[PDB]
Amino acid sequence: RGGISYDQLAKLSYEKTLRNLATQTQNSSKQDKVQKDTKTGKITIADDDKLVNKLAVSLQSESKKRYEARKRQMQNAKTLYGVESFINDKNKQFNEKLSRES
């Protein structure tokens, strides 16, 4: 049991997004360079604007999905426990935090 370290958590997050990129290519397949300017020193990479848009969309979708999966957790945990005496929400979140200690 126990917790998962950050180097093991990062690999599992990297393994998970590779399966999201695998099925994204499978759902697409189901439906149907390097230039180095010598004067400036800058390196320009030419890439597809669709794959850059799909990168920007999927990060926003994962940002909203974790935002909504946490918002429902806020609305559920506020309306679970009311037995022990509280005063405000920061007291409830602290007295619940004492319960996970024991």
Place this chain on the structure above:
RNA sequence: GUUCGCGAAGUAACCCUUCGUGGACAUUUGGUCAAUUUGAAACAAUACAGAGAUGAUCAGCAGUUCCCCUGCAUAAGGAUGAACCGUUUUACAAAGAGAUUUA
């Protein structure tokens, strides 16, 4: 202007006066700045509030700050000098079920 020469005129008798002409002496101040409104002090007054830890009443001492003010100050005081008192979501996974799809 002074002084050292030189030349001419007059008085002289080689000295004085006069005006011509070479030298020498002395040689570069001040402003970062213009004299009332438009290149910048600040108080006071009026209005509106009105002193931290509190259940009430009383001492304070710090800290953080791209706020300082008094003071000789590395002392101390400025309400414990003031401001602080809010807003708060992703380093995120692993297991186990029902609806909607796909081709």
